[PDB]
A paper describes a structure:
Here, we identify five lycibarbarspermidine glycosyltransferases, LbUGT1-5, which are the first phenolamide-type glycosyltransferases and catalyze regioselective glycosylation of dicaffeoylspermidines to form structurally diverse lycibarbarspermidines in wolfberry.
LbUGT1 is the only UGT that can recognize both the dihydrocaffeoyl and caffeoyl moieties, selectively catalyzing a sugar transfer to the 3’-OH of the caffeoyl group and the 4”-OH of the dihydrocaffeoyl group. In order to elucidate the molecular mechanism, the acceptor substrate 1 was docked into LbUGT1 structure, the MD simulations revealed the two active binding modes, corresponding to 4”-O-glycosylation (mode 1) and 3’-O-glycosylation (mode 2), respectively, which were verified by the small d1 and d2 values during the 50 ns simulations (left). In addition, both binding modes showed several negatively charged residues, i.e., aspartic acids and glutamic acids (E83, D197, D416, E418), reside near the positively charged N5 of the substrate 1 (protonated in physiological environment). These residues may stabilize the conformation of the substrate through electrostatic or salt bridge interactions, and thus could play a crucial role in recognizing the spermidine unit of the substrate.
Author numbering: 2 to 110, 112 to 252, 256 to 419, 421 to 485
Write the structure that this text describes.
């Protein structure tokens, strides 16, 4: 009884790999007639993927294959410090076709014909390898539907109408974008839409190749982004989210216990939770401005404070040993019993706790889906990538977040018009986020999304049937 194998090729890096495995197990646990091969690409300096890959146990219907090139080849692929990433992924094209002939599930025997490619956004170069075997490719976007509508619009502005999108940079003119109810102010656009860099022209070349695929799985659900989703036509969109990994309870549990044990002592829906994603940090004078707003607000707070990278290079934000380096004098011993300052945080464990009632966030989409899965309203303080669009959508389109400052951009090169958001903006945003008990109407819809996000994944839900339709078309390639 033959099955169908899907060749998952996520963009390199843990996070993309973890999201690819999450959606892979959703397909395997839904339909017995499918196996999946995840192809891992590893960068040289990526501790974490190396740490995470070693923990991978190959399920009987799920094989994790590592296909990276020898270091001789990879080293010769740093030639362009802004075309590295597209060059690196393309560099694995010959080792992908080798996997198809040797290590894949094909040649039979549980064993079955190859059936499709599910590629990440940065892996559109793999569409051509899938066509050498006369087999359709797919896209799995861990971003949302509104960002796909934004990519289609700016791909059209750049390649079809040949518009120089630099004009919209920090502008006050409002754009009409398919999938956005109200005009989009230019100053809220992600930098990838206005920056004329090398990386963005190669990124929008990948958006042009979205049209060659059979389908696109987006990490959202129909009731969350209804206007953005119904503006997308080619190709067929499958909202299968919210896809999210709760299982990795690890930051291991001993420090989470103290954080959880402390939140257990706080009143319910009373603590506003500070966190800014994997690479989010702040400069000395901005952390200063946050401590004043937190004290001046009067609410309980769990603040995740990480230490910045050296700015030369040097990987991700770290952790402090003591926050005597960072914090204003007396703030620590004055927020005794009301506030706590940590480094890396068990985000899902914190957001699921009943004491947390507000989530100030950079609006990274995985973080947003985690907050909405537990009904926690958001304070929007975006930093990088598409987060400025996530913020504008959550604040102005979905009524699910209060603005801290939507036109904020964290500059890694050492680009923005605003350096410091003030404690007066932070406290006023926090004051509005936790206000009015549970008659806060932004909090009211956050409650609703928790029920709708849970309903979308169970049988009968929009994401459940949409995922069921994705599998049917995948097996329709094999018949
Ligand atoms: O202090 C932190 C910051 C982030 N995360 C986790 O890291 C991911 C961040 O998601 P996001 O979409 O924001 O990705 P990013 O924007 O960080 O690249 C989520 O799964 C969070 O649970 C965490 O556990 N602790
Ligand atoms: Cl967690």
């Amino acid at each position: 009884t033959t099955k169908a194998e899907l060749v998952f090729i996520p963009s390199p890096g843990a996070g993309h790999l973890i999201s690819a495995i999450e959606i892979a197990k959703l397909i395997l646990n839904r339909d017995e007639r499918l196996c999946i091969s995840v192809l891992i690409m590893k960068l040289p300096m990526d501790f974490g993927v190396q740490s995470y890959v070693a923990s991978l146990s190959s399920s009987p219907r799920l094989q994790f294959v590592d296909i990276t090139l020898d270091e001789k080849t990879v080293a010769g692929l740093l030639k362009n410090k802004e075309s590295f990433f597209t060059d690196f992924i393309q560099g694995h094209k010959p080792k992908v076709k080798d996997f198809i002939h040797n290590t894949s599930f094909s040649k039979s025997g549980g064993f079955s014909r190859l059936a499709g490619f599910v590629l990440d956004m940065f892996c559109t170069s793999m569409i051509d390898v899938a066509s050498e075997f006369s087999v359709p490719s797919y896209i799995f976007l861990t971003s949302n539907a509104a960002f796909l509508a934004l990519c289609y619009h700016f791909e059209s502005l750049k390649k079809e109408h040949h518009i120089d999108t630099s004009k919209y940079k920090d502008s006050d003119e409002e754009l009409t974008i398919p999938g956005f109810k109200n005009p989009y102010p230019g100053k809220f656009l992600p930098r990838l839409t206005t920056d004329q860099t090398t990386a963005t022209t190669l990124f929008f070349d990948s958006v042009t190749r979205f049209k060659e695929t059979k389908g696109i799985m987006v990490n959202t659900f129909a009731e969350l982004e209804p206007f953005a989703l119904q503006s997308l036509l080619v190709p067929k969109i499958y909202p299968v989210g919210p896809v999210v990994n709760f299982k990795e309870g690890g930051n291991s549990e001993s420090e989470t216990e103290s954080i959880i044990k402390w939140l257990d002592d706080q009143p319910e829906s009373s603590v506003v939770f500070l966190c800014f994603g994997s690479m989010g940090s702040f400069d000395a004078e901005q952390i200063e401005e946050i401590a004043v707003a937190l004290e001046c607000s009067g609410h309980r707070f769990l603040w995740s404070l990480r230490r910045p990278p050296p700015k030369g290079k040097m990987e991700l934000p770290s952790n402090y040993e003591d926050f005597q380096e960072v914090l204003p004098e007396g703030f620590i011993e004055r927020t005794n019993g009301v506030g706590k300052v940590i480094g890396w945080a068990p985000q899902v464990a914190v957001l699921s706790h009943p004491a947390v009632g507000g989530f100030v966030s950079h609006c990274g989409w995985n973080s947003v889906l985690e907050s909405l899965c537990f009904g926690v309203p958001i304070g929007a303080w975006p930093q990088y990538a598409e987060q400025q669009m996530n913020a504008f959508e959550l604040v102005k389109q979905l009524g699910l977040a209060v603005e801290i400052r939507m036109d904020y951009f964290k500059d890694f090169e050492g680009h923005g018009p605003v350096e410091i958001v003030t404690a007066k903006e932070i406290a006023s945003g926090i004051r509005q986020l936790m206000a009015d008990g549970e008659e806060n109407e932004i909090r009211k819809r956050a409650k609703e999304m928790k029920e709708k996000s849970s309903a979308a994944m169970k049988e009968g839900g929009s994401s459940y049937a949409s995922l069921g339709l994705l599998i049917e078309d995948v097996i329709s390639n094999i018949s």
